[PDB]
């Protein structure tokens, strides 16, 4: 279970919703936290999904976009379980999550996705990640827009056999 693991909760958050979820997961599980920080922070304008020319619109229609991240984990291999959280952007993971997954060799490493959203599910995000990084030990993830309890998290660990 959660006590049986060295855990890192890594997350990307622009408006703080996913950050608050990450902090709660960490509090419950006793995990360490890592903020995936962009080298160039996203502004309000950048995040305007109604503007086809906004940074986020342009990045998200480019399958090869890789926003740069500020900083590096020194000993990521010391963590046995990595949770990776993000807002849903255009039905998938933001491409900074691709930058993150490609910054380390996560082959053979247990990764559990989580997300927040304005209504869309995490399933489409997961299927795309599963195909993009087949050598990661992906465990079933969760959309976490609701109430996160210690029972929800302990069941989750049970369901994914951690
Ligand atoms: C560029 C952009 C695209 C988004 N795309 C979706 C989407 O496809 N489906 C959805 O339900 N919400 C979408 N959202 C809403 C975010 O997923 C949601 O507001 C999230 O909780 C924000 O998390 P954050 O505060 O940690 O940045 C989008 C938000 C942005 C800024
Ligand atoms: Na896999």
UniProtKB/TrEMBL annotation:
GO molecular function: FMN binding
InterPro entries: Flavodoxin/NO_synth, Flavoprotein-like_sf
The entry's keywords: Flavoprotein, FMN, Nucleotide-binding
UniProt binding sites for FMN: 13-15, 17-18, 88, 90-91, 118, 120
Pfam families for the chain: Flavodoxin_4
Transmembrane segments: none
NCBIfam families linked: PRK07116.1 (NF005501)
Full protein name: Uncharacterized protein
Organism: Bacteroides fragilis (strain ATCC 25285 / DSM 2151 / CCUG 4856 / JCM 11019 / LMG 10263 / NCTC 9343 / Onslow / VPI 2553 / EN-2)
């Amino acid at each position: 279970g959660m006590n049986d693991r060295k855990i890192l909760v890594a997350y990307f958050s622009c408006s703080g919703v996913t950050k608050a979820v990450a902090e709660k997961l960490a509090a419950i599980t006793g995990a360490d936290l890592y903020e995936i920080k962009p080298e160039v922070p996203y502004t309000e304008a950048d995040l305007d999904w109604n503007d086809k020319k906004s940074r986020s619109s342009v990045e998200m229609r480019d399958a090869l976009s890789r926003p740069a991240i500020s900083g590096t984990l020194f000993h990521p291999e010391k963590y046995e379980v990595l949770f990776v959280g993000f807002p849903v952007w255009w039905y998938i993971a933001p491409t900074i999550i691709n930058t993150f997954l490609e910054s380390y060799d996560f082959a053979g490493k247990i990764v559990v996705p989580f997300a927040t959203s304005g209504g869309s599910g995490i399933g489409n995000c997961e299927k795309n990640l599963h195909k993009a990084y087949p050598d990661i030990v992906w465990k079933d993830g969760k959309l976490l827009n609701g109430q996160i309890t210690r029972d929800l998290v302990t069941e989750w660990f049970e369901k994914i056999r951690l």
